[PDB]
Design a protein around this ligand. Structure first.
Ligand SMILES: [Cl-]
Length: 127
């Protein structure tokens, strides 16, 4: 458990592979008002498990509308070109629809929030 918390510092992707790692990071992001980045990333991970093509289409539109589109309530601050590439992808949705956008939010978290998380009292109190 102390060992596991230490493991989260191996890399951002290692943190993300642990349910308690995700929960802890989620809580931290709420304190910096950026948890939408992780919510979007996790939604994309769930999206990639979709088998049904009808569900794929409806779920792609919901995720796009929530996080990516103009006026998204949980808009992620990815670059405008990636947003428009994503909008084009959504004209014929597939399992790769969000790859570029997910990649950008992953990078934002790995480079900005994750290093800050590892210096937080929230994390350090777990040893
Ligand atoms: Cl990714």
């Amino acid at each position: 458990s102390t060992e596991e918390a230490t493991r989260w510092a191996d890399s951002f992707d290692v943190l993300l592979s642990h349910k308690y790692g995700v929960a802890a990071f989620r809580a931290f992001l709420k304190t910096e008002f950026s948890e939408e980045n992780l919510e979007f990333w996790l939604a994309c991970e769930e999206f990639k498990k979709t088998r049904s093509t009808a569900k794929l289409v409806s779920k792609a539109h919901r995720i796009f509308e929530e996080f990516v589109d103009v006026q998204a309530p949980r808009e992620v601050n990815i670059d405008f070109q990636t947003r428009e590439a994503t909008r084009k992808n959504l004209q014929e949705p597939s399992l790769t629809c969000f790859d570029q956008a997910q990649g950008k939010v992953h990078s934002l978290m790995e480079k900005d929030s994750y290093p800050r998380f590892l210096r937080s009292k929230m994390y350090l109190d777990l040893l």
